[PDB]
Amino acid sequence: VSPIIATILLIAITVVLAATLVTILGGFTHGVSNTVETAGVTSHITSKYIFINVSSSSSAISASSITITITGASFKVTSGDTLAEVAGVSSTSSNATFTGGSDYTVPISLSSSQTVAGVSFELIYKGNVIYNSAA
Amino acid sequence: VSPIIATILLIAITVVLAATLVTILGGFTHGVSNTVETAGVTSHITSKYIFINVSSSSSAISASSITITITGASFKVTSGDTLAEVAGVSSTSSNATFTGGSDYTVPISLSSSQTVAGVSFELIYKGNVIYNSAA
Amino acid sequence: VSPIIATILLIAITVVLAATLVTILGGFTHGVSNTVETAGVTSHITSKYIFINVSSSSSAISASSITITITGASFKVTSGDTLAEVAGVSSTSSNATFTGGSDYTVPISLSSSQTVAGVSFELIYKGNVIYNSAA
Amino acid sequence: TITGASFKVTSGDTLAEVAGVSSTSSNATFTGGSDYTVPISLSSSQTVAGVSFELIYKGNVIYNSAA
Amino acid sequence: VSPIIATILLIAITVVLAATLVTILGGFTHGVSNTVETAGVTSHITSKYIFINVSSSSSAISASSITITITGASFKVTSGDTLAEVAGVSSTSSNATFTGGSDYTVPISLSSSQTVAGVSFELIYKGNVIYNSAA
Numbered sequence: 001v002s003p004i005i006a007t008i009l010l011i012a013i014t015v016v017l018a019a020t021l022v023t024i025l026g027g028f029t030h031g032v033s034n035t036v037e038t039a040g041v042t043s044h045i046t047s048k049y050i051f052i053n054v055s056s057s058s059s060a061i062s063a064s065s066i067t068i069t070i071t072g073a074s075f076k077v078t079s080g081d082t083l084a085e086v087a088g089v090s091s092t093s094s095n096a097t098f099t100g101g102s103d104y105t106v107p108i109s110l111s112s113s114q115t116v117a118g119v120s121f122e123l124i125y126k127g128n129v130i131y132n133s134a135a
Numbered sequence: 136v137s138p139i140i141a142t143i144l145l146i147a148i149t150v151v152l153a154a155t156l157v158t159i160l161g162g163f164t165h166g167v168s169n170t171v172e173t174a175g176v177t178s179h180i181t182s183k184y185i186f187i188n189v190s191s192s193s194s195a196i197s198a199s200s201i202t203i204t205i206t207g208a209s210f211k212v213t214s215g216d217t218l219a220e221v222a223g224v225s226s227t228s229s230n231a232t233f234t235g236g237s238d239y240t241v242p243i244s245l246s247s248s249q250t251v252a253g254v255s256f257e258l259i260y261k262g263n264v265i266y267n268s269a270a
Numbered sequence: 271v272s273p274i275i276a277t278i279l280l281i282a283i284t285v286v287l288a289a290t291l292v293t294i295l296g297g298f299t300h301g302v303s304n305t306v307e308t309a310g311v312t313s314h315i316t317s318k319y320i321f322i323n324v325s326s327s328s329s330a331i332s333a334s335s336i337t338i339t340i341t342g343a344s345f346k347v348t349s350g351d352t353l354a355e356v357a358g359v360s361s362t363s364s365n366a367t368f369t370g371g372s373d374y375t376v377p378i379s380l381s382s383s384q385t386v387a388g389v390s391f392e393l394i395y396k397g398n399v400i401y402n403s404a405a
Numbered sequence: 406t407i408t409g410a411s412f413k414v415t416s417g418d419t420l421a422e423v424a425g426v427s428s429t430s431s432n433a434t435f436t437g438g439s440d441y442t443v444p445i446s447l448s449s450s451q452t453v454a455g456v457s458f459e460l461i462y463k464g465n466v467i468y469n470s471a472a
Numbered sequence: 473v474s475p476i477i478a479t480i481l482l483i484a485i486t487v488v489l490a491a492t493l494v495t496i497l498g499g500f501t502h503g504v505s506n507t508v509e510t511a512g513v514t515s516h517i518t519s520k521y522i523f524i525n526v527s528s529s530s531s532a533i534s535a536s537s538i539t540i541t542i543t544g545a546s547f548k549v550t551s552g553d554t555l556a557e558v559a560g561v562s563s564t565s566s567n568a569t570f571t572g573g574s575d576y577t578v579p580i581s582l583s584s585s586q587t588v589a590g591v592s593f594e595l596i597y598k599g600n601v602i603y604n605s606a607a
């Protein structure tokens with residue numbers, strides 16, 4: 001009798017270990033994706049505007065998917081920080097897509113202590129910095 | 136008595152499980168091989184002929200092992216689709232082996248609607264495309 | 271008893287899988303070598319002779335290791351197609367090695383329909399084309 | 406083991422034996438830096454392009470020239 | 473009884489194998505680091521002195537971290553073979569760091585048989601040769 005009953009108990013234990021292992025693996029098998037992007041970008045800064053002109057890109061991406069951050073200055077548009085938003089890009093505009101041939105103008109404001117030589121900015125896509133004016 | 140008899144039964148069951156597992160593994164341990172090939176190939180297309188000239192290759196391979204496929208045209212030789220066959224390669228010919236220094240001429244025919252600008256072809260070896268004229 | 275016997279069977283199976291894998295890898299770990307060569311070569315063609323003059327090379331190599339192929343003409347020497355052989359290079363000759371300062375003369379014959387403007391040739395080493403008169 | 410050819414040494418089929426390895430020879434041990442030369446013979450119908458061979462140790466194939 | 477006891481023994485064996493494997497891996501996971509360095513160096517040799525002038529370097533490094541070796545001559549300073557040591561570099565000296573703009577003078581002695589045309593030297597950092605006067 002007893003060697004067969006002991007075998008049935010060990011099968012029951014084995015299934016719970018396998019079910020446990022499956023939940024451990026689930027912490028590895030997510031959140032990996034191709035996030036690399038690369039663009040030819042040129043820029044010019046003035047007391048009132050930043051100009052951004054794109055010559056080429058690795059892929060065609062929405063101007064709403066790109067986040068812009070700034071130091072030494074402030075944006076004249078206050079709703080948020082996507083490139084489409086601060087640049088005043090309408091959905092019908094040619095500049096709705098970030099690719100070679102797209103140009104943007106961003107309006108900015110400086111304090112009494114701030115100066116043009118102190119201003120810099122960065123473009124971020126999927127958590128990677130794709131451009132930095134101070135490079 | 137009974138604990139020993141129960142043990143003999145469990146050994147008999149164990150052998151059949153091991154024999155079962157061996158047949159499961161046989162579905163994994165076959166059909167893996169090194170099929171990669173790479174060649175410097177140049178080509179010119181005309182209303183009557185395709186010319187193919189080889190400058191180098193990763194390995195030396197038989198011209199009968201390479202399959203050719205075509206669109207926008209048709210072959211003048213109708214027996215099949217190996218490179219040796221459609222190019223009229225005899226077994227004594229220098230061009231029996233695909234390597235740097237081997238040249239081939241393939242004769243072709245166009246319909247009333249077909250034109251030279253529409254023709255393209257590919258070379259396939261061991262199920263991989265090794266050249267494509269429209270790349 | 272049975273969990274230990276099952277373990278011994280799984281070790282026996284494991285060794286055969288490892289031995290199988292070793293024979294799969296053997297199809298990758300051969301036939302890779304540095305075959306690149308590069309030479310400064312100049313040439314002149316006439317109704318009777320091809321002249322080939324070498325100014326520099328990436329390495330010093332035997333004139334018997336180089337294969338020559340021709341179109342629009344034929345060689346006067348019929349034994350084979352190595353450069354040393356068709357050029358009549360003796361083992362004591364200065365031109366036994368292909369390097370800067372080595373010169374070769376190859377004798378050729380044309381049919382009633384062939385002409386000097388139609389002749390061309392190539393030099394091949396380790397399956398790569400190293401010179402082509404029609405480039 | 407060999408196909409498409411034959412060994413010039415006929416006593417057997419161990420690597421040491423067909424290669425003519427003496428017990429004092431450097432090549433008595435199979436390791437990095439060991440080199441062997443095996444002499445062979447071809448028939449009137451056999452050719453170099455047809456020859457291939459394999460090395461076997463403890464019943465496993467460890468090398469195959471036709472891989 | 474016995475299938476559970478056999479399972480407890482196999483767990484005990486498993487832990488010792490895992491502990492063994494951990495000590496095998498420790499032979500791989502050490503002694504890998506970025507040791508590459510690259511410098512623009514120029515030098516002049518005389519019957520009494522070697523002059524060494526640095527124009528640029530990949531990184532800024534201590535003159536005590538660089539080892540110098542010589543042939544065809546001997547150093548006038550006998551304590552050792554670091555660059556700082558044989559060149560007489562004090563800790564306050566500008567030339568304490570190896571970078572563009574650092575210059576060194578090393579005093580040397582020749583035998584009755586030695587001559588200036590026979591002298592050469594090398595600079596070594598982290599086991600890599602970074603300069604060789606006879607290149």
Ligand SMILES: *[C@@H]1O[C@H](CO)[C@H](O)[C@H](O[C@@H]2O[C@H](CO)[C@@H](O[C@@H]3O[C@H](CS(=O)(=O)O)[C@H](O)[C@H](O[C@H]4O[C@H](CO[C@H]5O[C@H](CO)[C@@H](O)[C@H](O)[C@@H]5O)[C@@H](O)[C@H](O[C@H]5O[C@H](CO)[C@@H](O)[C@H](O)[C@@H]5O)[C@@H]4O)[C@H]3O[C@@H]3O[C@H]([C@H](O)CO)[C@H](O)[C@H](O)[C@H]3O)[C@H](O)[C@H]2O)[C@H]1O
Nearest residue numbers: 061062063064065066082083084085089090091092096097
């Ligand atoms: C699983 O597999 C599937 C199949 O392959 C998918 O691949 C999935 O991946 C997800 O897919 C969903 C659906 O495509 C994605 O959700 C979209 O997310 C984008 C953001 S993104 O940066 O552009 O990539 C948008 O938010 C998009 O929304 C569209 O629709 C919005 C609402 O429009 C709807 O309602 C109006 C009426 O108000 C209708 O006229 C219209 O037809 C539609 O029904 C739009 O506002 C939006 O415009 C702007 O959106 C963002 C800002 O939010 C901006 O970045 C864009 O550039 C654009 O200017 C856009 O047109 C999402 O699509 C879904 O749409 C449904 C809607 O019901 C239609 O089905 C929802 O209402 C939501 O809007 C939204 O879920 C998701 O991102 C992918 O992960 C795999 O996971």
Ligand SMILES: *[C@@H]1O[C@H](CO)[C@H](O)[C@H](O[C@@H]2O[C@H](CO)[C@@H](O[C@@H]3O[C@H](CS(=O)(=O)O)[C@H](O)[C@H](O[C@H]4O[C@H](CO[C@H]5O[C@H](CO)[C@@H](O)[C@H](O)[C@@H]5O)[C@@H](O)[C@H](O[C@H]5O[C@H](CO)[C@@H](O)[C@H](O)[C@@H]5O)[C@@H]4O)[C@H]3O[C@@H]3O[C@H]([C@H](O)CO)[C@H](O)[C@H](O)[C@H]3O)[C@H](O)[C@H]2O)[C@H]1O
Nearest residue numbers: 049086087088089090092093094095096103104105106107
């Ligand atoms: C992506 O693609 C899109 C689409 O192609 C854009 O091109 C985007 O780049 C943006 O382009 C816009 C448009 O040029 C830029 O916005 C302008 O900034 C200029 C200054 S500039 O020196 O001329 O170059 C202007 O300020 C312009 O606005 C005009 O409108 C102002 C407000 O007028 C509005 O309101 C009145 C009522 O009060 C209405 O009657 C009128 O119709 C209009 O709706 C005017 O004050 C302004 O006059 C003076 O402006 C400046 C001083 O600020 C001065 O330098 C000028 O010479 C001029 O004398 C001018 O007439 C801005 O355009 C936007 O206009 C909207 C308005 O709602 C209409 O849409 C806003 O009110 C803001 O005024 C402004 O956003 C933008 O900066 C670029 O990013 C590409 O990236």
Ligand SMILES: *[C@@H]1O[C@H](CO)[C@H](O)[C@H](O[C@@H]2O[C@H](CO)[C@@H](O[C@@H]3O[C@H](CS(=O)(=O)O)[C@H](O)[C@H](O[C@H]4O[C@H](CO[C@H]5O[C@H](CO)[C@@H](O)[C@H](O)[C@@H]5O)[C@@H](O)[C@H](O[C@H]5O[C@H](CO)[C@@H](O)[C@H](O)[C@@H]5O)[C@@H]4O)[C@H]3O[C@@H]3O[C@H]([C@H](O)CO)[C@H](O)[C@H](O)[C@H]3O)[C@H](O)[C@H]2O)[C@H]1O
Nearest residue numbers: 184221222223224225227228229230231238239240241242
């Ligand atoms: C690999 O390596 C091999 C070996 O080196 C090849 O080089 C291969 O490349 C192939 O080369 C062959 C040979 O050149 C190519 O085939 C020829 O195509 C030409 C056209 S071309 O413009 O001259 O360049 C010819 O069509 C040539 O055929 C000749 O033969 C035709 C038929 O004659 C046969 O039958 C008669 C009886 O009717 C016999 O008396 C005769 O002896 C022969 O057996 C002739 O019609 C033809 O005359 C005219 O041809 C064309 C018009 O089509 C015209 O442009 C010419 O100016 C000429 O006036 C010519 O005399 C083709 O060669 C093959 O010949 C065989 C024949 O059986 C002998 O073997 C076939 O019958 C076909 O005619 C043809 O396949 C080939 O295209 C290349 O792939 C390398 O890749």
Ligand SMILES: *[C@@H]1O[C@H](CO)[C@H](O)[C@H](O[C@@H]2O[C@H](CO)[C@@H](O[C@@H]3O[C@H](CS(=O)(=O)O)[C@H](O)[C@H](O[C@H]4O[C@H](CO[C@H]5O[C@H](CO)[C@@H](O)[C@H](O)[C@@H]5O)[C@@H](O)[C@H](O[C@H]5O[C@H](CO)[C@@H](O)[C@H](O)[C@@H]5O)[C@@H]4O)[C@H]3O[C@@H]3O[C@H]([C@H](O)CO)[C@H](O)[C@H](O)[C@H]3O)[C@H](O)[C@H]2O)[C@H]1O
Nearest residue numbers: 319356357358359360362363364365366373374375376377
């Ligand atoms: C690498 O390095 C090597 C070594 O340095 C070579 O330099 C090689 O380049 C080769 O050089 C040789 C030698 O020059 C070239 O071969 C010659 O081609 C010339 C033609 S040319 O216009 O003068 O330049 C000659 O044909 C020369 O042969 C002579 O020999 C012929 C045969 O004579 C032989 O047989 C008779 C018996 O019948 C013997 O008595 C005699 O001793 C000899 O063994 C003669 O016919 C020939 O006379 C006429 O030749 C031509 C017409 O073809 C005419 O233009 C001349 O003006 C002359 O009146 C001449 O006396 C070729 O040299 C080789 O000679 C051997 C012979 O066995 C001796 O070795 C062969 O029999 C061939 O005749 C021939 O191969 C070669 O072409 C270059 O590749 C570098 O690349």
Ligand SMILES: *[C@@H]1O[C@H](CO)[C@H](O)[C@H](O[C@@H]2O[C@H](CO)[C@@H](O[C@@H]3O[C@H](CS(=O)(=O)O)[C@H](O)[C@H](O[C@H]4O[C@H](CO[C@H]5O[C@H](CO)[C@@H](O)[C@H](O)[C@@H]5O)[C@@H](O)[C@H](O[C@H]5O[C@H](CO)[C@@H](O)[C@H](O)[C@@H]5O)[C@@H]4O)[C@H]3O[C@@H]3O[C@H]([C@H](O)CO)[C@H](O)[C@H](O)[C@H]3O)[C@H](O)[C@H]2O)[C@H]1O
Nearest residue numbers: 423424425426427429430431432433440441442443444445
């Ligand atoms: C492991 O490590 C060991 C030890 O280091 C080996 O290196 C082994 O590799 C083997 O090496 C041997 C030695 O090189 C190879 O055997 C030789 O094959 C060559 C041919 S080759 O082209 O020169 O490379 C020779 O055949 C050589 O034999 C010589 O001996 C022949 C017979 O002479 C014997 O008998 C006469 C009496 O008749 C005696 O006087 C003499 O002293 C000797 O005992 C000669 O015929 C031969 O002359 C010609 O040989 C060939 C033609 O076959 C020709 O190409 C040559 O240019 C030359 O003109 C030459 O003098 C082989 O060596 C062995 O010699 C023994 C002999 O008993 C002495 O030990 C046998 O009789 C055989 O002749 C032969 O086995 C071997 O192939 C490699 O495997 C590493 O793997």
Ligand SMILES: *[C@@H]1O[C@H](CO)[C@H](O)[C@H](O[C@@H]2O[C@H](CO)[C@@H](O[C@@H]3O[C@H](CS(=O)(=O)O)[C@H](O)[C@H](O[C@H]4O[C@H](CO[C@H]5O[C@H](CO)[C@@H](O)[C@H](O)[C@@H]5O)[C@@H](O)[C@H](O[C@H]5O[C@H](CO)[C@@H](O)[C@H](O)[C@@H]5O)[C@@H]4O)[C@H]3O[C@@H]3O[C@H]([C@H](O)CO)[C@H](O)[C@H](O)[C@H]3O)[C@H](O)[C@H]2O)[C@H]1O
Nearest residue numbers: 533534535536537538554555556557561562563564568569
């Ligand atoms: C683990 O993680 C840590 C934290 O990140 C480290 O990264 C560690 O890496 C090791 O760090 C230690 C400590 O930094 C390194 O040891 C130094 O090795 C260098 C050699 S190196 O080529 O310059 O790179 C030096 O030997 C250095 O010593 C300094 O101190 C010496 C003694 O000075 C002490 O005593 C005097 C009184 O006599 C005091 O006034 C002084 O304040 C100090 O307490 C100096 O002689 C020495 O000068 C010269 O040293 C070398 C020649 O030996 C020469 O090449 C230099 O250019 C320089 O001219 C230098 O100033 C080591 O630092 C440690 O200092 C302690 C001391 O107690 C202070 O803490 C010891 O006494 C030893 O001197 C020494 O261990 C080690 O190389 C790194 O691997 C990670 O592994």
Ligand SMILES: *[C@@H]1O[C@H](CO)[C@H](O)[C@H](O[C@@H]2O[C@H](CO)[C@@H](O[C@@H]3O[C@H](CS(=O)(=O)O)[C@H](O)[C@H](O[C@H]4O[C@H](CO[C@H]5O[C@H](CO)[C@@H](O)[C@H](O)[C@@H]5O)[C@@H](O)[C@H](O[C@H]5O[C@H](CO)[C@@H](O)[C@H](O)[C@@H]5O)[C@@H]4O)[C@H]3O[C@@H]3O[C@H]([C@H](O)CO)[C@H](O)[C@H](O)[C@H]3O)[C@H](O)[C@H]2O)[C@H]1O
Nearest residue numbers: 521558559560561562564565566567568575576577578579
């Ligand atoms: C890194 O950065 C550092 C700091 O900037 C250095 O620049 C280093 O390069 C080194 O520079 C030093 C300094 O120039 C070089 O050493 C000198 O070699 C010259 C020869 S040279 O042709 O003039 O160019 C000198 O030999 C010089 O020494 C002087 O001192 C000698 C000894 O005098 C000492 O002892 C006496 C007592 O006997 C004291 O009174 C005196 O104060 C001093 O302490 C003198 O003999 C010498 O006179 C003659 O020297 C030569 C012949 O050898 C002759 O050509 C001259 O024209 C002159 O007539 C001269 O006055 C060396 O400097 C060091 O001096 C120390 C001394 O202890 C003081 O510190 C040693 O004793 C040695 O003499 C010597 O090391 C060095 O070669 C460079 O590597 C950068 O790489």
